[PDB]
Amino acid sequence: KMSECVLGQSKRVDFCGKGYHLMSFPQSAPHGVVFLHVTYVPAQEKNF
Amino acid sequence: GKIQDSLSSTASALGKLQDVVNQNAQALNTLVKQLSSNFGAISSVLNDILSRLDPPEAEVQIDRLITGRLQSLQTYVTQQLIRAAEIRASANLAATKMSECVLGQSKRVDFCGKGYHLMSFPQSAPHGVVFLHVTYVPAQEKNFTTAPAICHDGKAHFPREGVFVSNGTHWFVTQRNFYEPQIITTDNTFVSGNCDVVIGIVNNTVYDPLQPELD
Amino acid sequence: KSFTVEKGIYQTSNFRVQPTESIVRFPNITNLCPFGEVFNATRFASVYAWNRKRISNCVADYSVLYNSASFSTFKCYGVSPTKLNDLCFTNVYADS
Amino acid sequence: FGGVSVITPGTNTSNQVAVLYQGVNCTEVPNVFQTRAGCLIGAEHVNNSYECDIPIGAGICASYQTSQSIIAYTMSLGAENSVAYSNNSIAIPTNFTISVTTEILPVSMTKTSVDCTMYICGDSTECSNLLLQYGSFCTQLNRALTGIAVEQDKNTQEVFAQVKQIYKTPPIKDFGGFNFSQILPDPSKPSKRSFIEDLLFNKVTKFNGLTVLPPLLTDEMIAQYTSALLAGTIT
Amino acid sequence: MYICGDSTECSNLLLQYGSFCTQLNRALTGIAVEQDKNTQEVFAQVKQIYKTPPIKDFGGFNFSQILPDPSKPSKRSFIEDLLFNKVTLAKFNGLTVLPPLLTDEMIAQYTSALLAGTITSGWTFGAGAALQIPFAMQMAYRFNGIGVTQNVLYENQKLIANQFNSAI
Ligand SMILES: *[C@@H]1O[C@H](CO)[C@@H](O[C@@H]2O[C@H](CO)[C@@H](O)[C@H](O)[C@H]2NC(C)=O)[C@H](O)[C@H]1NC(C)=O
Ligand SMILES: *[C@@H]1O[C@H](CO)[C@@H](O[C@@H]2O[C@H](CO)[C@@H](O)[C@H](O)[C@H]2NC(C)=O)[C@H](O)[C@H]1NC(C)=O
Ligand SMILES: *[C@@H]1O[C@H](CO)[C@@H](O)[C@H](O)[C@H]1NC(C)=O
Ligand SMILES: *[C@@H]1O[C@H](CO)[C@@H](O)[C@H](O)[C@H]1NC(C)=O
Ligand SMILES: *[C@@H]1O[C@H](CO)[C@@H](O)[C@H](O)[C@H]1NC(C)=O
Ligand SMILES: *[C@@H]1O[C@H](CO)[C@@H](O)[C@H](O)[C@H]1NC(C)=O
Ligand SMILES: *[C@@H]1O[C@H](CO)[C@@H](O)[C@H](O)[C@H]1NC(C)=O
Ligand SMILES: *[C@@H]1O[C@H](CO)[C@@H](O)[C@H](O)[C@H]1NC(C)=O
Ligand SMILES: *[C@@H]1O[C@H](CO)[C@@H](O)[C@H](O)[C@H]1NC(C)=O
Ligand SMILES: *[C@@H]1O[C@H](CO)[C@@H](O)[C@H](O)[C@H]1NC(C)=O
Fold this sequence. Notes:
The structure is cut from a larger assembly and holds 5 copies of chain A.
Chain A: H1 2-6, E1 20-29, E2 32-40
Antiparallel strand pairs in A: 1-2
The complex binds a molecule of 2 linked components (NAG-NAG) (2 copies) and 2-acetamido-2-deoxy-beta-D-glucopyranose (NAG) (8 copies).
The site of one 2-acetamido-2-deoxy-beta-D-glucopyranose has 2 residues of chain D, from loops.
């Protein structure tokens, strides 16, 4: 995820968080890694 | 050519693979040696114990050996399974690298080699698969001033596929990964909305190549 | 287990600081527990009736009980007799 | 109480050693530089920071290179340079370099078989009967090892056998200036193994009731699958 | 030490058993290396640490939580600094708990480098020498990958920046 999501955008759906993925920011915790995922979701719809 | 030289000059390439080979060999060797250990018994060799002991006594000592020997076997099988599972994961990854780098191109960054993976080749190794990764890395970078949108008539264009890059004399559009400069034109742009809203914008000309030809 | 060693870090043996002195701080009481009045007495009771002559608050000895009387049987369970000298028990009971 | 680890550059290079007692205070017992991972004795703490060499613990690393003496550095990670940033400044590459990187992953291990009866109770029938009382132990062990061997065979099938047909490279060498001679099979050499593969093979290097079963796929057969995939990719 | 304890007599019986004593220690050490090595694989993704740019211009994006604070000790980000605060709120015998190869401090630097790398150079740093790019411009590329045209980002960068800032 660190290589796949932080370094470049991941095409695989639901690899990074939920929805379309723009980028991820790595975080450090004791004995763990916390990832913040930036994702694009379509809010509103009009029928056509 | 370099890779051939690197492989012949050191055992480090196979260290990741070799560690697995050595570690498995060492585990088997310990267990085999175990046979020598008494495990609380009168004597290590099984036949020797049977030869010098009457059945009831021999019964007890045999049981002791089996318990000691059963435990030894259990450790090996338990040890082997964990290693087997670990190897299995590599094969899936191993099998994945065998097919995915090799068949098609992987858009995922750093999954195969370092940098953009153009193609990959796999070389058989004893008890392992070696993957050679061809990747594209951009060596040289030249500083350029850039802006997001260009306002021509109060409508601002954006690049169709490339960031706007200006030496500082004129504004041209080049692909973000290699420096190719193309005179900005309608063909390389599209105009949406009005150039008041965009945070960063630079006034610039448009070519309209059909206009000089028509006249 | 090899003549030649590659560069690295290897752990070979544990290091224990070894204690400089042995310090014994047994209870200060001088009074000694008596085993004669229970051993060597006028008469005991019936085998269906016993007396737990509980022993507490004194300092015992057991080497005296090895050659003074040659006992017919002497089976020390859960304990090694000869080492009974160097450990402090709790609420010793005698039966007869 | 503490474990002792001796840091050696390597027997071949030198005989000098550095011993780090693990956890014990440096003053304890008899250049006893006191670290945070224990109490090193036989190394000189430098002020400079180099790449890791002989890892120790909590930062400190030991190297045989600074006439010669094992020195323990603080293991700084990388050179700190900040890419020049601005809203109006961009950098675009003018040249590109193609490179080859090798990643090495294990696919299988020696299929090992152990008869439970023969190792545990030996030749004697008397001893074997005692083993029977335990019952399912023997059988369970044999089954697990058999399963592992099958997985070792299966893992190979999955990793290499992704192609139904063994494609064979064209006699023509018109590959648009790419020389693939080393990676591709050589007709002169036995087992149809590529030159790069040969080097890899060279570098890697009934006994007592334990039997190593033959691999389901031979080394030569594995090379063909690998050769086929490579052949298929180029063509 | 654990099984036999201090006494020499207890040790002799352990010798009879074999290399079980020795084998168990080896397995634990392997595990110990993995936890350090694991860390190495996960965080040593960058060849060289990149200092965070002094200029904070983020093209309308506020990264104060994510990025490390110089004033604060230990170089841990607001998110990062606080996480240790939360975790804190949330040998002795036969057992030595060895320290890791990478000190928590060092791990902090690695994370910062990736964060610094991502913002300043996009995905260029992953594949080679990091290339400085405008953040707005980087985001523009990101939209293109997911099929939303870059103009879209530029038209309402302000709206996007606020949502991102609010989300963080
Ligand atoms: C228990 O009986 C034994 C044996 O009679 C006593 O041991 C004798 O004690 C006297 C007086 O101290 C000594 O002079 C003798 O040498 C000892 N041996 C024998 C065989 O008489 C012992 O004192 C009595 N009481 C106990 C142990 O409490
Ligand atoms: C791009 O990089 C390549 C590879 O470094 C350059 O090719 C070299 O150019 C130098 C100078 O002309 C020659 O002496 C070398 O023989 C070339 N090969 C190598 C491997 O260095 C190339 O000049 C660079 N620039 C381009 C194509 O614009
Ligand atoms: C289009 O059709 C539905 C009909 O139920 C309508 O309510 C709404 O405007 C549109 N639907 C969605 C899911 O956006
Ligand atoms: C852009 O600037 C470079 C550097 O001065 C120059 O070589 C190039 O000619 C410029 N573009 C044009 C059209 O002159
Ligand atoms: C770029 O950032 C600087 C910060 O000093 C600011 O003065 C300038 O107006 C900005 N320009 C653009 C085009 O964003
Ligand atoms: C760009 O054009 C706009 C038109 O509204 C004008 O306000 C501005 O001064 C111009 N800037 C430059 C640098 O030409
Ligand atoms: C070691 O003991 C000395 C005793 O003076 C003390 O100053 C030092 O802080 C101790 N350090 C450790 C890790 O025990
Ligand atoms: C781009 O940025 C620097 C700023 O000092 C500039 O001088 C040089 O042309 C380039 N060098 C870099 C990014 O190191
Ligand atoms: C390819 O490599 C082989 C072996 O080094 C060599 O004989 C051959 O000349 C090389 N190049 C071409 C174009 O064949
Ligand atoms: C970001 O938010 C912090 C938190 O208050 C503030 O101090 C800082 O000035 C803001 N910086 C921006 C928008 O660059």
